[PDB]
Amino acid sequence: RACGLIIFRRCLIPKVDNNAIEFLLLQASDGIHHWTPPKGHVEPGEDDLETALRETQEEAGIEAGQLTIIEGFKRELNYVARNKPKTVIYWLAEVKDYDVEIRLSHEHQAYRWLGLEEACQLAQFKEMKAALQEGHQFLCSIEA
């Protein structure tokens, strides 16, 4: 059982920015092929949202002060990785600063900020794509 945050940022501009919302994906170092938002495993004590935040600071270097959780959205992904069964829960979180410092751990070798389409294209796996898409869709509704 793992929890994480679909991190996104807002790009606010007069046609300069192709998109108003960009997602953070992190590249796995081991395997060299996996792109996900920050996530990780639940500790014995831990609340699920507690993991998502903690794991976001560990994986991406983003502290809670640099983050705001969008209430009302959550997505449980159920799938199969490395011949093993996986459960990941994600919430949507927004970064306060466009230029927030991303600090990777050994687990990841690069990050990218992406518009919804390219993000889905990079994530590749259907459940992750589905989740980012519904994440975005959620965000558009709240806006209106």
Give the H or E element holding residue 88: strand 84-95
Three-state DSSP state, 76: strand
d(CA 63, CA 68): 10
CB under 8 Å to 49, separation ≥6 — which residues? Answer: 3, 69, 91
Cβ–Cβ < 8 Å for 72, 91:
no
CATH 3.90.79.10 matches 1-144: yes
Query: What tokens were used for 74?
Result: 């959550």
What technique solved it? X-ray
Which resolution in angstroms does this entry have?
2.7
